[PDB]
Structure formats: C-alpha cells, structure tokens
Write an enzyme that holds these catalytic residues in place. Sequence first.
Site, PDB file in Angstrom:
ATOM      1  N   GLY A   1       1.959   6.363   9.641  1.00  0.00           N
ATOM      2  CA  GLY A   1       3.406   6.395   9.415  1.00  0.00           C
ATOM      3  C   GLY A   1       4.070   5.154   9.979  1.00  0.00           C
TER       4      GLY A   1
ATOM      5  N   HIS B   1       0.838  -1.226   0.000  1.00  0.00           N
ATOM      6  CA  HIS B   1       0.000   0.000   0.000  1.00  0.00           C
ATOM      7  C   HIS B   1       0.869   1.271   0.000  1.00  0.00           C
ATOM      8  CE1 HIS B   1       0.208   1.091   4.224  1.00  0.00           C
ATOM      9  NE2 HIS B   1      -0.437   0.008   4.647  1.00  0.00           N
TER      10      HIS B   1
ATOM     11  N   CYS C   1       3.205   2.011   9.493  1.00  0.00           N
ATOM     12  CA  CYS C   1       3.162   0.861   8.561  1.00  0.00           C
ATOM     13  C   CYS C   1       4.588   0.422   8.183  1.00  0.00           C
ATOM     14  CB  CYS C   1       2.265   1.156   7.366  1.00  0.00           C
ATOM     15  SG  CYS C   1       0.555   1.534   7.855  1.00  0.00           S
TER      16      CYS C   1
HETATM   17  C1  LIG Z   1      -8.278   3.625  10.107  1.00  0.00           C
HETATM   18  C2  LIG Z   1      -7.166   4.301   9.371  1.00  0.00           C
HETATM   19  O1  LIG Z   1      -7.059   5.522   9.316  1.00  0.00           O
HETATM   20  N1  LIG Z   1      -6.264   3.505   8.804  1.00  0.00           N
HETATM   21  C3  LIG Z   1      -5.281   3.991   7.845  1.00  0.00           C
HETATM   22  C4  LIG Z   1      -4.207   4.873   8.502  1.00  0.00           C
HETATM   23  C5  LIG Z   1      -3.499   4.187   9.644  1.00  0.00           C
HETATM   24  C6  LIG Z   1      -2.560   3.197   9.404  1.00  0.00           C
HETATM   25  C7  LIG Z   1      -1.929   2.536  10.441  1.00  0.00           C
HETATM   26  C8  LIG Z   1      -2.230   2.867  11.746  1.00  0.00           C
HETATM   27  O2  LIG Z   1      -1.615   2.192  12.746  1.00  0.00           O
HETATM   28  C9  LIG Z   1      -3.166   3.850  12.014  1.00  0.00           C
HETATM   29  C10 LIG Z   1      -3.793   4.499  10.964  1.00  0.00           C
HETATM   30  C11 LIG Z   1      -4.665   2.759   7.195  1.00  0.00           C
HETATM   31  O3  LIG Z   1      -5.030   1.630   7.518  1.00  0.00           O
HETATM   32  N2  LIG Z   1      -3.703   2.982   6.306  1.00  0.00           N
HETATM   33  C12 LIG Z   1      -2.847   1.907   5.851  1.00  0.00           C
HETATM   34  C13 LIG Z   1      -3.544   1.094   4.853  1.00  0.00           C
HETATM   35  C14 LIG Z   1      -3.998   0.484   3.926  1.00  0.00           C
HETATM   36 BR1  LIG Z   1      -4.581  -0.380   2.301  1.00  0.00          BR
END
Ligand SMILES: CC(=O)N[C@@H](Cc1ccc(O)cc1)C(=O)NCC#CBr
Lengths: 304, 304
Positions: free
Chosen positions: B143, B41, B145
């Site tokens: 950030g 992603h 990930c």
């Molecule tokens: C609910 C939300 O905002 N999820 C987002 C941003 C996010 C990512 C990791 C984390 O620990 C917290 C927030 C997300 O999952 N992004 C990655 C993907 C895909 Br395909």
Amino acid sequence: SGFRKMAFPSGKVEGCMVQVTCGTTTLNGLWLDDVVYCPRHVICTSEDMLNPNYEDLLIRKSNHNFLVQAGNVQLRVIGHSMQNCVLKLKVDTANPKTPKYKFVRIQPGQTFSVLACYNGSPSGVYQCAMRPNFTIKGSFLNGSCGSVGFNIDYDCVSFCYMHHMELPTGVHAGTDLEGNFYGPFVDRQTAQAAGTDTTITVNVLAWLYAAVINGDRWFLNRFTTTLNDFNLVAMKYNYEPLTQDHVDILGPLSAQTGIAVLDMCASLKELLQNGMNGRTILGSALLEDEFTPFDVVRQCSGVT
Amino acid sequence: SGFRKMAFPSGKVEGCMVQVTCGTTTLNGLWLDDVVYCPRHVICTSEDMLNPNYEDLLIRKSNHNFLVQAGNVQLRVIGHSMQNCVLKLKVDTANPKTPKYKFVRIQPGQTFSVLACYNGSPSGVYQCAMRPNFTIKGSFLNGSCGSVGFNIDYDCVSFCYMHHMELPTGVHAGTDLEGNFYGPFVDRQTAQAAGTDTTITVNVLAWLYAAVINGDRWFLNRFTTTLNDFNLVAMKYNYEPLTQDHVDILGPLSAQTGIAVLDMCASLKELLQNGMNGRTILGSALLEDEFTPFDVVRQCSGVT
Ligand SMILES: CC(=O)N[C@@H](Cc1ccc(O)cc1)C(=O)NCC#CBr
Ligand SMILES: CC(=O)N[C@@H](Cc1ccc(O)cc1)C(=O)NCC#CBr
C-alpha cells in the site's frame, strides 16, 4: 518490510510554529488558537540566566515587548501570563491552522516526534524518547528553544514537550505544555547533572519483536526466563525493571509473532550477557530502546 | 548539541499526497499542478506482476478507471500517459497546495526524506540514502507504493524517489519522478538480487566530523594516511573508494574542526581495523553512512 526510526508527519505542527523575540533573544513559539506558548527564559539576558527571578524580570515586560511573527506577518499581543516555566502570549488572531490538539505529560520510556525550529521556521523532524532520567537526547542548537515534541492520533496532535535547555553534558531538558519540567531540571544556567540513563527494557523487547516481524531472527534462542530472573540480569546492565504491565503491553507483538514475552526476555538476556558478536539487528549494533510497543505495531501495521 | 537522523519537515509533501485506485489496487499518488504521478504497476492484477506488458494492460484502461481522491474529495481525470515506469494522470484541478518543486535524479550516497503513505495519507517520515547498489533501506508495507523521497532547499521541494517495490530480500527499489528506476531494477515480480551494499565512505567521514563537533572525540588518533593507503583498507571493508572530490566536499567540516580529511581517514582506518571495542559514537555502535557532508553542516548550523 523494513523498520526505520520514523517521526510523525510534521505538517500539522509546522502550521503552529512562530518566532518570539524579547529584547535581543529570539526563539520559537507554539501558536494554538489565540495563545502563543514559549519558554519563559525568552525574557532573560545571558547574565539573568545564572540566577533569574522570573516574576521580577516579567514586571519590566509589556505586551508590546513580545514580538511574535508568523511567517513574515506580525501578531498583535493583547495579553501575557506566566504558567510554571512557559509564557502564554494572548494574540488578537486565532491560528487558522490550529489542529485538533491536547497537552499531555508523557512518562519516561514514551517516544515522540520533535520538529526542530529556528526563528519560527521548521529545520527538521526526528524521533525521541523521554529517558528514564527525564532528559531527552535531541538535536538542538541555540535558537531551538520553544521547539515542541508531539504524537499524532489520526488528526489530533498531543503536544508533550517544549525544548528549554541543554545541560553542560549536551543532553536536553524541557517542559510539558503546562510549563512543568520533566524531571528535576530548572530553567537556570546552574550545575544540573542528569541521573543514570537506564535502557527502556519494554522498548528493547518491542524492537526485538519488530526485528522478528522483519525477518531478523538470528538472536532467537531455545531459552525462557521469569520476570524475577530477567530483572536480576536487567538491573546488572542498567535496564529498567520489566513489570507484568510491560508484559501485557507486549501482548499484541507476542500474539503476532507467536513468541512468548518471557522467551523474548530470555533472548534479550543472552544478548546482554554475550553481546552482538559483531552482528546487527535491524541495521543496529546495539539494542534500540526508542520504539514503544505502540510504535512497533503502528509501523508494522501502517497506521495513518 | 546532539546529532539525530533528521528528516525534512514533511508538510509541503503531505499537501501533495493522494490516493490512486485502479480496479482492486490502491496506492499513493503525488499531485503537483494538474498531474498526479503514480507507479504504473497500479494497473496490474497480482497475476500481471509476474510478466506485465504495461502498454498492452494500459489499452484496457480509460481516464474513468483511475480513481483519484485528495482527502475525501474525488479528482476528475481528464488524461493519462505512461512515462517510463510512472503514470501521469492529468486532473481538471491544479493542486492548490503545490509547493515550488523540481524533479532530480540523485546519485548513490545521497540522502533524502521519505513520507511513508497508505491510501494517500501520511503515516510517517524518515531519512534514507540511495545505497551504492541503488536500493534503499526503507520502511514500506504493501500500500506504500507511490510514497516519495525528497529534499527541501528553503521553499523548493526536490522530489528524487517514488517507491515501487520490495525485493524478496526486503530491500526497496523505485524510480525518479521521470519513472526511471534507480539501478537495474524493473517493475516485475521476478528474481532481482541487489549487488554489494558497500558503505558510503564520504558519509561516514562526515558523521565522524559530526561526532567531533558534538564532543565525541575518543576515536581521534595520532595518525594520518594517503588516499591510496586509505582506499586499500576501504576496499578490504567494502567501503566506497574516497576521491579528491570527496576530500573537497568535506573541506567545510575539515575547516570547522581543524582536522585534516586525511587525518580523519586515518581515524576511520583504525576504527575499521580495530572495531569500536564496545564503545559508541553519537549513540551508534557502528559507523553511520546515511549523513552527507551537506546534511552534517545543515544540522550543525540549523538551516531552515
Ligand atoms: C516482495 C513483495 O511482496 N513485493 C510486492 C508488495 C510490496 C510492495 C511494496 C512494499 O514496500 C512491500 C511489499 C511488490 O513489490 N509490489 C509492487 C510491485 C510491483 Br511490479
Ligand atoms: C549549555 C548551553 O549553552 N545552554 C544554553 C544555550 C542552548 C540552548 C538550547 C540548546 O539546545 C543548546 C544550547 C541554554 O540552555 N539556554 C536556554 C536556557 C535557559 Br534558563
């Protein structure tokens, strides 16, 4: 989202851990520059521990009696001195992995990471607080002495604790890196009882702010209070008094959440008086007090 | 004595963390040998996340679009491939800090350490478990990930998790290092609800053994039970069934304490039916289920 009891990354400290042996006793040393720091009780026989005279015991010790091993390589000891309750072993080699560092003496309520070591080898890392009774609630087996507590500010390791001993109640006592014990404890196997382990009120409030930020809001109520009214209830529950300085320190979390510190105090008041009623906050059934306001902001903002 | 939620020392993993940028997205990479592993992603615009076609998005990406930075030094990307939900970026330089390592796929109930990172920089380390619903209860901001989960056996790092996403319920989902999601989760910003987060029974029993070893014994009672009788009560409380395999795995803690596993089951039965009555066990007001039998033996024996 989410909120965990989080330690500093331990790499910078792993690079400083060595094994110190004196006679039959092996424990851990901290190697910074050309000095290895360790508990002075490394020189004691199990007999000695009951009533040690460290100056007298130290007379019988030479440089060559302090066996210092970094990984599986022996360091040459070219000098030794006692500072308070630590030994400083001068070695002929600067630790090439010495990080930027400071020695700090923390206050009760302050948190730090512990790198638990045996035979100079890292075992695990966990988060602790200096308790109001100057104990820490660690995880330390025999051989863990010389394990250290620290904080990191970016690339500078502030060493604040060295593990020296376990009290008969299985709580922990140790020194700063100048060898001064936290609290009234001494490195002798005598009767030493800890005082009241009170709850670190400002830390509980920080964690309640952490809970709100992370969506855990059921405990927020319609009430406010005053410092004096809250403190009446705090004392009754063996919580530390809350001061204006604590209120000021929570200011950032107050601003981020829009919840006035005295409103959060009134929420905490109701939790103390009513209990959790089988509910949880950030996965805990009791009020957590080993996160500082700084810890909550760091973890909620992702500082590295 | 004492018992803490303890992570592995993170040094070996700190040495593998890099920053990966694709267009406006920065997240973390794991650099092992001449390959950087990261969530696929990284190639998605926030728009793309709703219904991504990764193969189609990847056509528009060249080696030079994947910006890989180790500390403040840029790595040259000489190849890229998608394996399941991870990208493998081939770089021209072997990570000189590559530890001995394995990729393992853990089972639900298994614990691991997480090194939370932002911009390729370690933020903190904490202990997690693979939940029975294949979520983890992490501490992960945007950030984070590409942050990884691991176990260490002496000098060999077993990587078991890479962080990919947070569900709307603020729980966490990710992959093994072959890019296969734990559980039914997909790397799309769609409706995904976790199933029942049941309690890891064998882990609770391990922790009750930890409590006895560390002097916390008030919950030991005069009763025994059978697997079938215990399991009737476990199911009622959303605890995982206990199997003979679990009984066998607790054998070491049973032997060390002299408490038969089925006797400890009967203690756990009474704790479920009666509650804690405001008491604590190893400083917790609820039954902890993120210590494996292996974790309890390791921590109680001081493995390094
Ligand atoms: C609910 C939300 O905002 N999820 C987002 C941003 C996010 C990512 C990791 C984390 O620990 C917290 C927030 C997300 O999952 N992004 C990655 C993907 C895909 Br395909
Ligand atoms: C109660 C007890 O056995 N304490 C011993 C052994 C011990 C040390 C550390 C630890 O974490 C667990 C046990 C002790 O304090 N030795 C060091 C000194 C001095 Br002077």
